[PDB]
Amino acid sequence: TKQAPGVSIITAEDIAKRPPSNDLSQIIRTMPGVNLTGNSSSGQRGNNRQIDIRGMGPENTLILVDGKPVSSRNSVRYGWRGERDSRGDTNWVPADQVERIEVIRGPAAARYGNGAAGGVVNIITKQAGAETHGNLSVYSNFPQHKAEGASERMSFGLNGPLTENLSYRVYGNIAKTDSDDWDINAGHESNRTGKQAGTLPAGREGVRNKDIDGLLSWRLTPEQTLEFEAGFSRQGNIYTGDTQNTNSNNYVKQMLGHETNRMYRETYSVTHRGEWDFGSSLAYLQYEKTRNSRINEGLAGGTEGIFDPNNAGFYTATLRDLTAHGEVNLPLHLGYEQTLTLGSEWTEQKLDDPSSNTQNTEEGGSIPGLAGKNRSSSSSARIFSLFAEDNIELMPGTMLTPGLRWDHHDIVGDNWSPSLNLSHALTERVTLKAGIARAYKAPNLYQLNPDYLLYSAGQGCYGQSTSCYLRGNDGLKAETSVNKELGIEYSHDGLVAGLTYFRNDYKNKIESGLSPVDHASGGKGDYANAAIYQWENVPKAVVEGLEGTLTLPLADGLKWSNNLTYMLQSKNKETGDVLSVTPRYTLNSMLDWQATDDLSLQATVTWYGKQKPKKYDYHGDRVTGSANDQLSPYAIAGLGGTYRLSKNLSLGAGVDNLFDKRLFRAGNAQGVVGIDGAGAATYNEPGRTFYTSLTASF
Ligand SMILES: O=C(N[C@H]1COC(=O)[C@@H](NC(=O)c2cccc(O)c2O)COC(=O)[C@@H](NC(=O)c2cccc(O)c2O)COC1=O)c1cccc(O)c1O
Ligand SMILES: [Fe+3]
């Protein structure tokens, strides 16, 4: 099946029948347990939603490509409210060159370590065969409303041998998603008066992609395989007015329709793969270098995350990420039949950010231990990791899998992430799964850095209206989560029915602090001697919910599939406010008709449950008026087909959002001075959209 308890596979065939515009988040998000959310509840950068597993937020969703981490979003400033001006890390690999996507949720994911507390998404690429194969894929959509940005996508692939013991695979992608019109939210915006009269919450950012990958596989012996690959990708945006607080100035307007951020992502990887009688061996070296070039933004209050007109022009943040991994796999014949895996991991994150550490102390007064100008640009962390998995068969059908992961973070210290996963054949048709693990989150290099300094004159300060600083804190503990899950699945002759309960107990969630630790000295007028908050560890939080799947073969030619997410609870146990904003539930429903040998037809519906905003503003006080707005449940329906013209040529065509259900970003969730809040109404849902596709392959 494509759905076991805790796990989902998306195949190449699935990608082709529900083609994504551009980014894979579109299809990844239809798996059980998966939402498309921001990281916290501000609604800041709310059209920049990313993959969330079990409401643990997208910082706790680890993206791999062929088992190798993507860290590129770690190059974008992490803001006061736990959001980056980032589109996330699911748009580096082009849809049509993906063989399959693996989603691993909760206790089964903890064994991957740092940032898998929600889960792992592993995007797997198509590889060389015994012969040469290749493809040319093109997709083009056509929105009903011209405001909304159309998408165009062209990707090739080409793989095969060179010698009897040398293989290669290459691909390249060129794609563009046009931005929404600067004015798409006009007449839908929250009430904006005084200085902020005229301001707009923005529609979806556009992006231009250029992806090129080369791989050489070398199997110099029957038992021994050696892979070298390099990756070059480039995303440039099309700016449509997006700003942290939905405030505007003249620089912002100058940049409507222009590239204001570019990400270059370069990966080189060496991978050796061993298979001999004693068992299996795998080790890799990845060097990921990300250049995040964007227009300077301010770091104070309502100037946080708007283009700074006094310091016009681009800066470039640089992320050098180094990953090396070793594992072996030992069949053991013992008093119980089992398979043992032993592994080290080593990672280094260097971050050079020439912008984020430039907030100065002239207004709020100076901060003992923090230089007011020319602070370091530099951050780094090394994690060393050892782990073993023991995959024990107690009696045929049953598996017990205990694993220990230990990590040395060179700042935060030692972490112990133990795990245990049971699966039980009760019947040849019914399987019970239970799992309890403690997953791991190392603080990000922004949270961790005492040189990283934000300021507010009050409006953003917890439990007061006075000026305050927020400061990085190298004293922070790692976030840990005891991810529990209990689940049952019936499977027999493509009849699949399964339901999982999950509870993640969340300890030391890192977040802008609630109490001043200190007070600065000096500065100007009423703002002088500002309060100092740090990034704190929140003692306790909880997420809880249900994952369901049901697959019925109506007839031979015809398959009815459903995936269900239901979010029971999401609670910061300190403040009692929500962690994420998700829909209460999500049901994805596909009907797949194999109408002919050659013609396949697809109907889909997605139902989103109610969405409620945060109860408390940045002060910790209760929000009022349009800050309380909720989004009603709504559904999006679609038809598509694929008509195979030959072994060499297939055509696709369809319609997303048949009944043109549309939603509009009204702004951020809470009121500020002159900008009423928009509650849960923080993103744009696109309208009816026709799409066509063509795939030629040998
Ligand atoms: O969303 C926030 N602002 C809005 C709304 O804020 C306002 O409209 C005013 N604002 C306050 O009255 C305020 C009264 C008491 C305390 C304030 O902080 C006020 O801002 C004026 O500030 C501004 O116009 C700008 N602002 C600064 O230049 C600033 C410079 C340095 C330091 C600042 O604090 C600044 O605001 C932009 O502010 C905005 O657009 C916002 C969020 C998070 C934290 C904030 O502080 C925000 O203000
Ligand atoms: Fe302010």
Q: What is the 3-state secondary structure (H, E, C) of 615-659?
A: CECCCCCECCHHHHCCECCEEEEEEEEEEEEECCEEEEEEEECCC
Q: Dihedral sign, CA of 123, 128, 129, 133?
A: positive
341: left (phi over 0), alpha (psi -120 to 50) or beta: beta
Ligand 1 atom 1: the closest Cα is on which residue? 302
Task: Give distance in angstroms: CA of 8 to centre of ligand 1.
Answer: 45
Ligand nearest to the CA of 363: 1
- Residue 619 is encoded by which pair of tokens? 């002060």
Q: How far is the CA of 613 from the centre of ligand 1 (A)?
A: 22
Taking the chain, what is the end-to-end CA distance rounded to the nearest angstrom?
28
Enter the tokens of residue 296: 């300077």
Establish whether residue 589 lines the binding site of ligand 1, counting it when its CB lies within 6 angstroms of any ligand atom. no
Give the mutation target among 245, 304, 359, 459 for probing the ligand 1 site: most ligand atoms within 8 A of CB.
Answer: 459
Tell me the CA–centroid distance for residue 540 and ligand 2, in Å: 29
Q: What are phi and psi of 107, to 5 degrees?
A: -55, -25
Ligand 1 centroid, distance to 454 Cα (angstroms): 13
The CA dihedral of 313, 182, 76, 126, to the nearest 10 degrees, is: -120
**d(CA 300, ligand 1 centre) in Å:** 8
CA pair distance 447, 439, nearest whole angstrom: 19
Q: Which of 297, 524, 623, 673 to mutate to test the pocket of ligand 1 (most atoms within 8 A of CB)?
A: 673
Atom 2, ligand 1: residue with shortest CA distance:
302
Give the 3-state secondary structure percentages of the chain, helix then strand then coil, rounded to 5: 5, 55, 40
Where are the alpha helices (H) located in 190-236, listed in sequence order?
Answer: none
Euclidean distance between CA atoms 24 and 13, whole angstroms: 14
- Whose atoms come closest to the Cα of 247: which ligand? 1
Note residues around ion ligand 2 (Cβ under 5 angstroms).
Answer: 301-302, 456-457, 459
- Record the resolution, in angstroms: 3.1
The residue whose C-alpha atom lies closest to atom 26 belonging to ligand 1 is 302
Q: In one letter, which amino acid is 132?
A: T
Give the ligand at the shortest distance from the Cα of 243. Answer: 1
Asked if 452 and 610 count as a contact pair (C-beta separation under 8 A), the reply is no
Give the number of whichever ligand sits closest to the CA of residue 245: 1
Q: Does the CB atom of residue 302 touch ligand 1 within 6 A?
A: yes
Alpha carbon distance 95, 28 (integer Å): 11
CB under 8 Å to 507, separation ≥6 — which residues? 479, 480, 481, 482, 539, 540, 541
Mutate to test the pocket of ligand 1, among 195, 196, 246, 672 (most ligand atoms within 8 A of CB): 672
Range 3-697 has CATH code 2.40.170.20: yes
Q: How many angstroms does the Cα of residue 301 sit away from the middle of ligand 1?
A: 5
667 pocket-lining for ligand 1 (C-beta < 6 Å): no
Q: Whose CA is nearest to atom 7 of ligand 1?
A: 673
Q: Which residues, including other chains, have CB under 8 Å from residue 642's CB and lie 6 or more apart? A: 16, 17, 599, 600, 650, 651, 652, 693
- Residue in the structure block whose two tokens are 């100092």: 532
| Residue count (the chain) | 698
HEC string of 478-529 equals CEEEEEEEEEEEEEECCEEEEEEEEEEEEEEEEEECCCCCEECECCCHHHCC
**Chain centroid offset of residue 647 CA:** 36
Distance CA 410, CA 380 (A): 9
| Residue 456 CB–ligand 1 contact under 6 Å | yes
Whole-number Å distance between alpha carbons of 558 and 229: 41
* Cα–ligand 1 centroid distance for 669 (angstroms): 16
Other CB atoms within 10 A of residue 82 CB: 23
650 in contact with ligand 1, CB cutoff 6 A: no
* Ligand 1 center–CA 188 separation, angstroms: 23
Alpha-carbon dihedral sign for residues 184, 187, 189, 195:
positive
Q: How was this structure determined?
A: X-ray
The SS3 of residue 195 is: helix
Strand (E) or helix (H) holding 692: strand 689-697
303 Cβ inside 6 Å of ligand 1: yes
Q: How many Å lie between the centroid of ligand 1 and the Cα of residue 252?
A: 17
Strands, DSSP E only, in 513-573?
518-519, 531-555, 558-572
State in Å: Cα 457 to ligand 2 middle.
5
Within 8 A by CB and 6+ apart from 222, the residues are none
Residue 195 CB less than 6 A away from ligand 1 = yes
Number of helices (H) and strands (E), helices first, in the chain? 3, 33
Does 673 contact ligand 1 (Cβ within 6 A)?
yes
Ligand 1 pocket, residue 674 CB under 6 Å: yes
292 within ligand 1 shell (Cβ under 6 A): no
- Tokens representing 594? 């194999």
CA of 460 to the centre of ligand 2 (A): 6
Q: How far is the CA of 302 from the centre of ligand 1 (A)?
A: 4
